[PDB]
Design a protein around this ligand. Structure first.
Ligand code: COA
Ligand code: VQ1
Length: 196
């Protein structure tokens, strides 16, 4: 059984290596991040989300010291807007020549995002070495339990169809099935409190 707890600064190197490996060929990052130094760009994007969103204003869990990691914003993440505005320019630069694809996907998804306070899963990853052993479910469940306790929705977006069963088992339902012209099909998933 995996050991799940809140991340510390000590977990960041391993959590970043986990997130970089997990996202090495993820359809949304392939679509929206420059193919030049792609892994380095994706690695920096994941570290930005881990540190400036997760550890600073959100909630981060790790399984087995960062073999898996889940980053959330919560209803307490009131600075989310300010932080996204601060890191927006860096994320644009990391998009590089795929900026129009980054902007396209943001435009297509923003309207299907929660208009009320939510637990929003910003990024999650399991080390490819440790996949299919329950780390994914274990590192995500605490935020899902916390959303239900607060009586707000949990929300996430995925461009990997093989993820849909994983989130469905945790009680998420597809609330938007978004065709991205010349891009990856993307699902927005909501879990209302008590959905499972
Ligand atoms: C999706 C992910 C978070 C699930 O973590 P996990 O620990 O492998 O999942 P668990 O072991 O808890 O449960 C396995 C289930 O996850 C899904 N899954 C998705 N990709 C998988 C993979 N590479 N290996 C195993 N299961 C995978 C399946 O629904 C699987 O059930 P299955 O038995 O029918 O295959 C993880 O595989 C991952 O990080 N993948 C690479 C990057 C990614 O997709 N990030 C998600 C952000 S949208
Ligand atoms: C940094 O680049 C990434 C990182 C991860 C992913 C996969 C990740 N899906 C999973 C299941 O892991 C994913 O698609 N992440 C997207 C948004 O869903 C997410 N996001 C958008 N708005 C918010 C938000 N608020 C509005 C408060 N709070 C938290 N996360 C948010 O940030 C990332 C960039 O938009 C895709 C791209």
């Amino acid at each position: 059984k995996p050991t799940v707890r809140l991340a510390t600064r000590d977990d960041v190197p391993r959590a970043v290596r986990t997130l970089a490996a997990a996202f090495a060929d993820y359809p949304a990052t392939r679509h929206t991040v420059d193919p030049d130094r792609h892994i380095e760009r994706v690695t920096e994007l994941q570290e930005l989300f881990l540190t400036r969103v997760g550890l600073d204003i959100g909630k981060v869990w790790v399984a087995d010291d960062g073999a898996a990691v889940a980053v959330w914003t919560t209803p307490e993440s009131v600075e989310a807007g300010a932080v996204f505005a601060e890191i927006g320019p860096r994320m644009a630069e990391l998009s590089g020549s795929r900026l129009a694809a980054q902007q396209q996907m943001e435009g297509l998804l923003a309207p299907h995002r929660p208009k009320e306070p939510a637990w929003f899963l910003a990024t999650v990853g399991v080390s490819p070495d440790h996949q299919g052993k329950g780390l994914g479910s274990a590192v995500v469940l605490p935020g899902v339990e916390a959303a239900e306790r607060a009586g707000v929705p949990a929300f996430l977006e995925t461009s990997a169809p093989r993820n849909l069963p994983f989130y469905e088992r945790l009680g998420f339902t597809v609330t938007a099935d978004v065709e991205v012209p010349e891009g990856p099909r993307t699902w927005c998933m909501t879990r209302k409190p008590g959905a499972s």
